[PDB]
Amino acid sequence: ETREHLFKVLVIGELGVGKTSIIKRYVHQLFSQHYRATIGVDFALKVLNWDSRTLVRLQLWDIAGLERFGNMTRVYYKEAVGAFVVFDISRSSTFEAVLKWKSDLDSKVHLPNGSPIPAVLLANKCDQSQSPSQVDQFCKEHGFAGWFETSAKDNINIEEAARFLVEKILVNHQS
Ligand SMILES: Nc1nc2c(ncn2[C@@H]2O[C@H](COP(=O)(O)OP(=O)(O)OP(=O)(O)O)[C@@H](O)[C@H]2O)c(=O)[nH]1
Ligand SMILES: [Mg+2]
Fold it and tell me: Is 38 annotated as a binding residue?
């Protein structure tokens, strides 16, 4: 009965937006307020008991904030099947930069069938433009599968956001 999957998932976004902390909360249920800046790429494995016929493992690639200015993202993205694209809900510079990351991603990697990999937008630090129709419009226009406000600090919506992205990866993996 049981089926096991291993998926490569990217976590990308500007310096200091929370990439590392969202992964540490989701995988280890821990949070530190102390900023330790990531160098290049860091990794985690999440093991998700999806349901009774399904075990999913995620290989989480934590891409550091500077890496879009370097020349290695094509290597980093290779064979990814999903992405979280993370900004800091308090700092608009980090929101403007999400399209730079999103365009980098869509230039460099696609699913085996040629489509864009699903990508979910995480507005992180929600604990610190609050808009229902606007979200939908933005995601449609820039090819995001959905959008969640998150807190790594208070553990808000990180689990739901992950399950949402995994759900899209599973449909694509069956298709
Ligand atoms: N209040 C609050 N602070 C957060 C949250 N997520 C991250 N932080 C803080 O924001 C700072 C940056 O978090 P990191 O997870 O290191 O950021 P990063 O995106 O991994 O940064 P780079 O490694 O430089 O790419 C840290 O001090 C965190 O404690 C959150 O949900 N709420
Ligand atoms: Mg980091």
Answer: yes
Residue 105 CA to its chain's centroid (Å): 12
d(CA 47, CA 97): 30
CA atoms of 137 and 3, how far apart (whole Å): 36
Query: Contact at 8 Å (CB) between 116 and 83?
Result: no
Resolution in angstroms comes to 2.1
The count of structural domains within the chain is: 1
Question: Residue 171: exposed, middle, or buried by beta-carbon count in 10 A (0-12, 13-18, 19+)?
Answer: exposed
CATH for 174: 3.40.50.300
Domain residues for the domain of 135 are 1-175
Answer yes or no: is the C-beta of 35 below 6 A from any ligand 1 atom: yes
Residues 6+ apart with CB under 8 A from 160: 148
For ligand 1, is residue 94 a contact (CB within 6 Å)? no
Is any atom of ligand 1 closer than 6 Å to the C-beta of 19?
Answer: yes
Q: Ligand nearest 18 Cα, by number? A: 1
Atom number of ligand 1 nearest to Cα 66:
25
Say if ligand 1 is within 6 A of residue 54 CB: no
